Design a protein around this ligand. Structure first.
Ligand code: HEM
Ligand SMILES: [Zn+2]
Ligand SMILES: [Zn+2]
Length: 153
């Protein structure tokens, strides 16, 4: 798991995200969809977006990026004790949206990339390592719930 020093790194970086939730959210979803256009196919809501310029122009996509980062932030702030927050998310993503764990890996890479792009000075390799560990813990706990419900992978 994460050391206290590592949680400190994660939580101090997150405060920088909270200074511009919509901007980070929009950048992360666009990075995901450009890097892995197969992920776009899971969203009936967005699958009509064919080009990067169309994604940037979508107010609805920006709104969902706020939804995603708000939910992720609430989880990170629980410092590993996130069972009540994580369970409804695992439920809906396994049983309704049908999102494979690999796509959670892809969005984790997108988050790291955008944090680096927006915060090149402050987001050094130690914070990157710590953020990677936090996102791994998130995936590990979701995967456990997926396995319980008989989805896993
Ligand atoms: C950081 C990881 C993620 C977080 C925190 C997250 C959070 C959420 C939240 C809070 C909702 C709305 C409530 C719900 O339906 O559960 C949602 C909806 C959804 N999510 Fe996720 N999500 C994440 C990753 C993904 C990925 C990687 C995909 C697909 C590749 C995905 C697909 C969806 C879809 C299809 C919906 C329904 C959207 C709609 O039609 O309104 N999510 N997400
Ligand atoms: Zn891909
Ligand atoms: Zn706008």
């Amino acid at each position: 798991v994460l050391s206290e020093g590592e949680w400190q790194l994660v939580l101090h970086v997150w405060a920088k995200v909270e200074a511009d939730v919509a901007g980070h959210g929009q950048d992360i979803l666009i990075r995901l969809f450009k890097s892995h256009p197969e992920t776009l196919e899971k969203f009936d809501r967005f699958k009509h977006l064919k080009t990067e310029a169309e994604m940037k122009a979508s107010e609805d996509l920006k709104k969902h990026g706020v939804t995603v980062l708000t939910a992720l932030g609430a989880i990170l702030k629980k410092k590993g004790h996130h069972e009540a927050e994580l369970k409804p998310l695992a439920q809906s993503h396994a049983t309704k949206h049908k999102i494979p764990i690999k796509y959670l890996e892809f969005i984790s890479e997108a988050i790291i990339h955008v944090l680096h792009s927006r915060h090149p000075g402050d987001f050094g390799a130690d914070a990157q390592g710590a953020m990677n560990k936090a996102l791994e813990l998130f995936r590990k706990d979701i995967a456990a719930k997926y396995k319980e419900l008989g989805y896993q992978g």
